[PDB]
């Protein structure tokens, strides 16, 4: 019964916009991390502080699986110590991050003839996100001296822009689905373990 449900996180037919990033908590299951790294269908698989090859015989208090969609130019930004639109305003990772940043080209799934515009990103924000911060606010951004009173125009912008995901776009303007496995170990019971 209790294999860890990475199947439904990775092979999920719907992915989330990066600003409104989805986090699945993993607890009380046995996790076969081999399925993941033996796959030949991944563009990126950069792990930080931990070896995917050596943790299907280790246990942790909580594992988090964060899923979202960005363009290829931006997957480099899903990593400790990065900066830019995505790193600062959408999904930030901490400097001492422990886990795996897994990405793949999804141009076959997340593109349409006239442009798919369902996937969004926060363009403006007064300060950078803290690690694992998630802002879904649609506050009008005040760029200028005069305050906007929820009123959009000169120096007053709607804070979300849409990705223009067309099939004929160059790799890097095409969509990539990302999953970020993160691992914590407290002095509490451990419930996420490998088969060994």
């Amino acid at each position, epitope marked *: 019964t209790n294999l860890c449900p990475f199947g439904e996180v990775f092979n999920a037919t719907r992915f989330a916009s990066v600003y409104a990033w989805n986090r699945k908590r993993i607890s009380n299951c046995v996790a076969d991390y081999s399925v993941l*790294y033996n796959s030949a269908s991944f563009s990126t698989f950069k*792990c*930080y502080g931990v*070896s995917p090859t050596k943790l299907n015989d280790l246990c942790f208090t909580n594992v988090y699986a964060d899923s979202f969609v960005i363009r290829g130019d931006e997957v480099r930004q899903i990593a400790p110590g990065q900066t830019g639109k995505i790193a600062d305003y959408n999904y930030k990772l901490p400097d001492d991050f422990t886990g795996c940043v897994i990405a793949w080209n999804s141009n076959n799934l997340d593109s349409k003839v006239g442009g798919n515009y369902n996937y969004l990103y926060r363009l403006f924000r007064k300060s950078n996100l803290k690690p694992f911060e998630r802002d879904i606010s649609t506050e009008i951004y005040q760029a200028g001296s005069t305050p906007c009173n929820g009123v959009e125009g000169f120096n007053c912008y709607f804070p979300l822009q849409s990705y223009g995901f067309q099939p004929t776009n160059g790799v890097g303007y095409q969509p990539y689905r990302v999953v970020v496995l993160s691992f914590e170990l407290l002095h509490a019971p451990a419930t996420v373990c490998g088969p060994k």
Partner: antibody
Amino acid sequence: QMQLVQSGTEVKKPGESLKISCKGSGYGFITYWIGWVRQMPGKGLEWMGIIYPGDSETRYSPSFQGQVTISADKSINTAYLQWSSLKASDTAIYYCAGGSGISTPMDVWGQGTTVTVSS
Amino acid sequence: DIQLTQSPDSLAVSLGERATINCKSSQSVLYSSINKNYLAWYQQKPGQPPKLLIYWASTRESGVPDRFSGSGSGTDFTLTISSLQAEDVAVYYCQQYYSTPYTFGQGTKVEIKR
């Protein structure tokens, strides 16, 4: 489980360019970060730098910044370490090692490529 | 930029006796998120690549016999061979993988004493 295989012995004159290689075979490769270690004759190990093949993210050691170039080709699972102009002092044996993560021990090692630079 | 100092440089030990090697790190190598020190031990014999013995300061890499054990915390670490075997004559390096640039100890030469 997977393994790394390096280019054969080199013998060059001072001033010659050189590019030695390190190709990985085995499943679980998309995950591996590939580093270069230098061992001079009779001396200990010195970490030179590491690359991620998937996107060519390259970190150097202070001592080898802009003295060499670590490069990659994800299509053939191959990391490269190259000099534009060899000095006699570059005479050593160069190991490539592999960690399945960045901030990971080097699980897997190449057999070593012996480079002799001498007039 | 972390620096490691091993000691001693040289170490001679009778067959079946205890060998202890010390690694002093210029700085702590403790990841907060998983309570583990990011310190590894390698064995290197003549004309051979280095072999990973121990990682996370004290976890044995698979196929490493029981007689190798690693210990320490913060900045003082130890590799220990109980029962030195003929086949243990080698150089042993400690390496930190806490932060790039990774760094090795100067190495510890281990001989059989007779």
